A paper describes a structure:
Multisubunit Photosystem I ([name]) encompasses half of this Fe in its three Fe4S4 centers and is a target for degradation in insufficient Fe conditions, which reduces the capacity for CO2 fixation. [name] (thylakoid iron deficiency induced) is an iron starvation induced chlorophyll-binding protein found in multiple green algae including Dunaliella spp. isolated from coastal Arctic waters and hypersaline ponds. [name] and PSII are each associated with LHC proteins for increased absorption cross-section, LHCA for [name] and LHCB (or LHCBM) for PSII. In this work, we report high-resolution cryoelectron microscopy (cryo-EM) structures of [name]-[name] supercomplexes from Fe-starved compared to Fe-replete cells of both [name] and D. tertiolecta.
Cryo-EM analysis of the [name]-[name] supercomplexes from Fe-starved cells revealed major populations (~60% and 30% for [name] and D. tertiolecta, respectively) distinct from the [name]-LHCI1 structures found in the Fe-replete cells. The resulting structures (hereafter named [name]–LHCI2) reached overall resolutions of 2.9 Å for [name] and 2.7 Å for D. tertiolecta. The [name]–LHCI2 supercomplexes have an additional crescent-shaped [name] tetramer with associated pigments that is evident in both Dunaliella spp. grown in Fe-starved conditions. The larger size of the DsPSI–LHCI2 supercomplex versus the DtPSI–LHCI2 supercomplex in the biochemical preparations can be explained, in part, by the presence of [name], [name], [name], and the [name]-[name] dimer in the DsPSI–LHCI2 supercomplex, but not the DtPSI–LHCI2 supercomplex. In terms of pigments and cofactors, we identified [name] and D. tertiolecta [name]–LHCI2 supercomplexes to contain, respectively, 218 and 185 Chl a, 23 and 20 Chl b, 59 and 47 Car, 56 and 26 lipids, plus 3 Fe4S4, 1 Chl a’, and 2 phylloquinones in the reaction center. The majority of the pigment differences between [name] and D. tertiolecta correspond to pigments associated with the three extra PSA and two extra LHCA subunits in the DsPSI–LHCI2 supercomplex, accounting for a difference of 30 Chl a, 3 Chl b, and 11 Car molecules. The outer [name] tetramer of the Dunaliella spp. [name]–LHCI2 supercomplexes is rotated toward [name] by ~33 degrees, whereas in other reported green algal structures, the outer [name] tetramer is aligned with the inner [name] tetramer. In the DsPSI–LHCI2 structure, we note an interaction between the lumen side C-terminus of LHCA7b and the AC loop of [name], but this is not well-resolved in our EM density of the DtPSI–LHCI2 structure. We modeled three Cars in [name] in the same location as those in [name] in both structures, and 13 Chls in [name] and 12 in D. tertiolecta. Compared to a607LHCA3, a607TIDI1 is shifted 6.5 Å or 7.4 Å (Mg to Mg distance) and rotated by ~ 67 or 61 degrees in the [name] and D. tertiolecta supercomplexes, respectively.
Author numbering:
A (entry chain A): 12 to 751
B (entry chain C): 2 to 81
C (entry chain H): 36 to 133
D (entry chain D): 60 to 202
E (entry chain L): 44 to 150, 152 to 203
F (entry chain F): 68 to 232
The structure:
Amino acid sequence: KVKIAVDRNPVETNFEKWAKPGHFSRALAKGPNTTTWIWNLHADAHDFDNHTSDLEEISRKVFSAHFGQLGIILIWLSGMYFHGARFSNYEGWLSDPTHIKPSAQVVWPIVGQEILNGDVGGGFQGIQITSGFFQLWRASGITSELQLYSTAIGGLVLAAACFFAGWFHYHKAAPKLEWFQNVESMLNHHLAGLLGLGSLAWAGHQIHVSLPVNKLLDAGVDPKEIPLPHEFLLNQSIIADLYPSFSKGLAPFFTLNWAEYSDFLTFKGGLNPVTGGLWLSDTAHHHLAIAVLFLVAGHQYRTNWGIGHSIKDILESHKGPFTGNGHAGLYEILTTSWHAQLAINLALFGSLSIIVAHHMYAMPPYPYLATDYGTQLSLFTHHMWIGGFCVVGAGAHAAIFMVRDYDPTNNYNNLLDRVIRHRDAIISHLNWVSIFLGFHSFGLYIHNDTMSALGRPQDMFSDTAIQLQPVFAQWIQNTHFTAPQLTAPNALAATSLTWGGDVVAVGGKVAMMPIALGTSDFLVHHIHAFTIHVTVLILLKGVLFARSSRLIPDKANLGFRFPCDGPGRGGTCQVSAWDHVFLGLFWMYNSLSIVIFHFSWKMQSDVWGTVTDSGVSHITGGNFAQSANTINGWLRDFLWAQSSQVIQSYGSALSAYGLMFLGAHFVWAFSLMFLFSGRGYWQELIESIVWAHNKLRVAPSIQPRALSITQGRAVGVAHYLLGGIATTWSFFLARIIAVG
Amino acid sequence: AHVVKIYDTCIGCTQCVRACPLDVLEMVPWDGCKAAQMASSPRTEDCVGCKRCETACPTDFLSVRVYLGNESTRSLGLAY
Amino acid sequence: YGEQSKYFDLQDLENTTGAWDLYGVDEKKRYPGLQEEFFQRATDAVSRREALNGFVALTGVASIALFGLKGASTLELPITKGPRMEKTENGKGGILRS
Amino acid sequence: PWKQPELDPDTPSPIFGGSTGGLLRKAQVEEFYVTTWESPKEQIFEMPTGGAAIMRKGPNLLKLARKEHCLALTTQLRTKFRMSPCFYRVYADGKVEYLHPKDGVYPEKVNAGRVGVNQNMRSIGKNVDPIKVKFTGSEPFEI
Amino acid sequence: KPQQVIQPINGDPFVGMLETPVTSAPIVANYLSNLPAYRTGVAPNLRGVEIGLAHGFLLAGPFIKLGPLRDVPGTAEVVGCMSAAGLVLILALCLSLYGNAAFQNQPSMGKKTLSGRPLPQDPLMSEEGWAKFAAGFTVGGLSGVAWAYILTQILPYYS
Amino acid sequence: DIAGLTPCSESKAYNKLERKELKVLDKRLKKYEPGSAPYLALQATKERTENRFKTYAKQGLLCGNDGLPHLISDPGLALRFNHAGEVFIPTFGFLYVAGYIGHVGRQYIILSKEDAKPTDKEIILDVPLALKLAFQGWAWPLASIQELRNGSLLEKDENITVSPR
Ligand code: CLA
Ligand code: CLA
Ligand code: CLA
Ligand code: CLA
Ligand SMILES: CC1=C(\C=C/C(C)=C/C=C/C(C)=C/C=C/C=C(C)/C=C/C=C(C)/C=C/C2=C(C)CCCC2(C)C)C(C)(C)CCC1
Ligand SMILES: CC1=C(C/C=C(\C)CCC[C@H](C)CCC[C@H](C)CCCC(C)C)C(=O)c2ccccc2C1=O
Ligand code: SF4
């Protein structure tokens, strides 16, 4: 049944459609009469639903779009590898990671930029990087710049191959709709094939390459005399002395004697004390087990050989009486709607990126990464924000599916129809829990601020005063600390040092230390729960009310992204689901900003610091247990106690962070024009400017028009988000570079 | 409720009555246009002021005009 | 109403619009008989909204006036206690007023 | 139309599940709206306030809390199936009103049987300034 | 045999509720129908007596336990109780204001209990009936505040 | 010596600022060997700093109470005293280029408007005519003056869209 249906040469390879920029849309194919034609051109550029109603052409378009994005990412990765090969101090950083700051961007001496080439050590000057590529290139065993050059050239070659693949798979040999609808084959090939094959290849690379290099690196051996990994691969004698189980030579694997592999496939809890990262043997056994789990899970579905699982049968068979028809039609929706699958994949990708950030801040998987506070903070914040963006986009594309690809014929009493039916109950209960969480988190904060202001600290919600001890989180911490004792007896120590009892430190700085949770952590965590509940309320309400509502019954026929239905019913402004996503972007911004503020303050006040002989001294004075209970304490002891290096960064290596900070302030403040204002005033001002240009005959043939209401909202939210993100980025990076 | 007025510039494409999902506008015979039609608003008390007829109006300036003010339980679009 | 598929009849429109008391009973005097007249005589002097608005205001203004005049300084509220010796001078950058 | 039709209490209603979006206390206190149509067969439509409901072969009855819901359902039916339905209004005291065309051949047509109301013979923009109608109670567009 | 637990109320898919096990449970329905606010045959002052007693007994607790003078022994149990009594008086004033506001007109449409049999009019839905209800509420609240006060004086445990 | 500003050649705060900048720049010089490429870049930066301080002085530039040079904006005062290079000659220097862009934009707008569907010409530029007008705009004020007198530059408002107030 499953086969390869491909149509050969559907689209000629020519610049004929490049000559006319407006060709995907028949409304834009006429000409640019108004200036809104350009914004509609760059807006409907990748909206493939209104380009054509055929699902096959849309599938080919998005297939080659993913190919182009893959080629772009491969070009970017090859450029990063080339930068590490040519303009970097990776050779110096390998011989001294605890004293030489990483640097991989070198500026030109053109206009005053020589001050940005900071003294990072090792006889090298450049921009002190924060991506942590040096830690990754130390984990994956890389010694010289020749290897980075080879990796960069291979990445460029694969990027060219990916772009050629996109061109081929669209213009030359385009697959048919039945090829894309083979969901079982897709799932099997991207579970066993992609994930499983990549995990097994990475486990093999770690076992045969990264393990000996990292074993020789932390032993004090200089990387110059470290043997190249091909010597470890070909010769069993060199790999036998570092790991005695290699002398057996694949005998225990087939004879079921895997306990003999306990030297380089270890099960150890904690971090390597020499480097501060996870043990590479633990990561090798981890990726090998992940490859096993994905090889077994990739043979579940039925494609062509009878055996397996049919997803339609699995969905239609799970029917429970409070749900009526149980998952009855979801196979038909998910095999015919690109936006529904986009929403699911984006939501899971964003959540998994959030897990990625949390589990890198928890267990650093790279050598000399925990002590490099800047790389850890940047990785956590960056993947935090990318996960939030993917979740918000998931809500947006779910709303788009609701408007466009949802039909009432296939669904009568299924789960989606019943979610539509009781949407008011869901929204009302979410509003109740929203108000409840908002009050008994933020009103607790305001009450603590008031009792501090009224001179009554004994009436506050603090540890010294009456406290809200997070008993559940502390019990989970104690259970995980005592988990290797009873429930996981084969583990050497705890899986992370969040709940441990020992402090590791590399180079005199604290790598990872136990984290204490108090009343302030309780308040911030319930603030986070409140904020996430509000954002999910906004996104879910936008998705649910995109089709119809008690206000506007015909919202389905008005499209997804429309400004309003007029000032009727008192004014139906921002009633579209697009505007719900537009507000949810700001609520996401508030949520993740408070989350990363909590991360930075907690880690600087209770984890990060320099170890001494007389106890452990943190970066701050350990004031998180005393100042995070009030808003003014938060402000003064996080945004004002820090950022003293950003303002005084001028004349130093990090002055560009101050410039970026003030430019971010500019863009964040410039957005409020497009947010507060409307269009009629701007259109009338444009009319006056048009009269001015008409007076002396410089009238453009294209009529100047003000931005659309949805266009204005998009510009406002984009400038606001860019300004806020760059503000927090500059402040965080300058604080963590000038101090950490 | 709101006041909806139709001027003599109307020429009768009978499309402003389709864009109104409230049955406010009706079409009467006339003699001042080629189509011999003119928009009328008999149930002007049932209008909310959504201005969809204004979006559907092709004349410059618009033949049909909706003026806000004096809101009621039906012009506010409440089902409660 | 509700014979096979109909939900509207226009002579029992009390059922058509959906006005239904889901939790409503007509059981009279569930409490024991001697218990009512103790509280029935309690309410009859304050049953009128004029008598109740006055009584709440009577206990309102009098107890509010009692607080501060007599209500404070018996609970030792920290507003009518006075200072020991704090905050005569002001200004850390010099000048030292008062 | 030719004769004004009165809705029948006996007519069935489409099968539907419990939807939170529906009739409110305004149906009890104030008026509510009722939509009727005659069906050729059993088809699936989407209610303007709920999900999807399978309708009955023959007469049908919908109750909507707003007239906008009624005309949204009317436009959906006319677009999808060329259905041509009609809706009514039922008051609190039991009074029944007919708002969907009293002429019966829809506002899109003319029928030469309705009188022009709220029509100005002057052009838009030829109206007088508000100073000329100040302290009179009449707006310039109301003249 | 699908066991369609989730169904609309009275088989009517047009109105707000759908009969759900949160609503259609016999224990929940019996507990809600036996609550004083749904005893339609009982006089509204007798409703308000029980309602005010329960609410004034519960409202004393947070004021004693988390009051500004909670650390002062012997005086917290009186300050919390008189503040609870003041809160009961405030709620009684707002109840009387609601009774003035919402019953300046006359209702004309009944409640229609299930399968018919409706009584003429709820006395709670009237002006003087709601005034009597608020009177019962404030008397019950004051008595409950005094009872929670004397329960903090004589005690075998805590307060 | 106008407005109480000493010349930059005889200013103590100007030389103190130069000494302070040379001190911090030489502070980074002690962390690198003299035969290294960062040392050469730092040496070139110091040479550029010394050349800038020398060229900013002895050029009529002045400063007051800060060590940072000041600019004189009043014409005549910048002409009697040698200060026309600060803003007086850059004023005509910018206006020449500013009038260059305005003139070539006007000629392209006029040329494109006398063509079928002129809205396409704004998004589909033509290179030979735009580049010809780009290299035929050196005498922009001479073309601007002659069009001003004869009405080709301006337009009477009877064919200009005006507000209906
Ligand atoms: C085991 C086989 C296999 C493997 C490994 C993949 C791998 C991939 N597929 Mg999948 N796919 C498969 C079978 C497979 N496919 C089948 C059988 C179908 C039909 C049902 C599809 C249909 C399909 C669609 C519709 C889409 C993908 C996409 C993708 C990419 C997702 C990008 C990502 O997650 O980052 C991982 C990124 C990398 C690993 C970068 C390296 C990419 C290398 C060059 C690809 C090599 C794998 C390939 C199968 C080798 C054979 C191809 C040969 C003709 C040269 C990923 C490379 C997306 C896409 O367009 O990207 C191409 C997408 O939208 N797949
Ligand atoms: C898996 C990723 C993915 C995919 C495949 C799509 C695909 C699609 N989305 Mg979705 N979306 C995503 C992620 C994704 N999106 C995320 C993460 C968000 C949250 C921000 C959204 C939010 C979103 C909305 C709100 C809408 C879409 C729409 C669309 C459609 C057209 C998009 C288009 O033409 O953009 C055109 C491309 C651009 C306009 C360029 C982007 C420029 C942005 C605004 C600024 C970027 C600045 C950059 C970050 C920094 C530069 C700084 C500057 C100084 C240079 C298409 C179906 C639209 C639609 O109609 O759907 C059918 C629509 O309304 N999406
Ligand atoms: C920090 C700025 C800020 C604040 C505080 C609010 C506050 C609010 N917004 Mg908003 N929001 C803002 C900016 C803000 N907004 C911006 C800029 C946008 C545009 C993107 C939005 C977008 C937005 C959406 C899309 C939604 C909200 C909602 C809400 C509500 C959440 C209530 C809650 O759970 O918290 C609890 C209440 C508070 C934090 C308010 C302050 C309470 C203090 C502590 C006083 C406590 C009681 C006090 C003593 C009483 C005083 C008595 C006095 C009168 C005598 C609330 C009214 C949501 C809503 O309606 O609720 C679900 C909602 O859906 N807002
Ligand atoms: C070359 C074309 C051209 C010309 C001659 C003018 C001329 C004028 N404009 Mg306009 N303007 C233009 C393009 C042009 N504008 C464009 C493209 C925009 C959009 C960004 C604007 C936006 C604009 C506003 C918002 C305002 C003016 C105003 C003015 C007046 C003040 C002079 C000035 O410098 O304004 C300042 C002009 C700008 C800041 C716009 C700069 C944009 C660049 C420089 C134009 C690029 C054009 C391009 C290079 C030409 C193509 C060359 C060809 C060979 C292909 C004057 C009548 C003002 C007015 O009403 O005064 C009475 C006013 O408020 N203009
Ligand atoms: C990263 C990167 C790179 C680099 C490197 C690489 C990538 C290399 C290679 C690699 C490879 C090339 C790999 C491979 C792998 C493999 C595997 C992983 C396998 C597996 C297997 C399985 C799963 C199974 C098997 C078997 C058995 C066991 C038995 C018998 C049967 C059979 C045979 C089936 C490049 C530049 C390119 C690009 C960019 C990025
Ligand atoms: C300011 C504003 C405008 C006016 C803004 C417009 C017309 C967009 C202008 C975009 C410009 C033309 C893009 C290019 C900017 C500069 C010309 C770039 C200069 C680059 C240098 C190298 C010269 C709206 O139209 C609007 C609409 C709806 C809500 C809010 C607003 C709103 O706030
Ligand atoms: S202000 Fe704008 S968004 Fe709001 S109803 Fe008017 S036109 Fe629509």
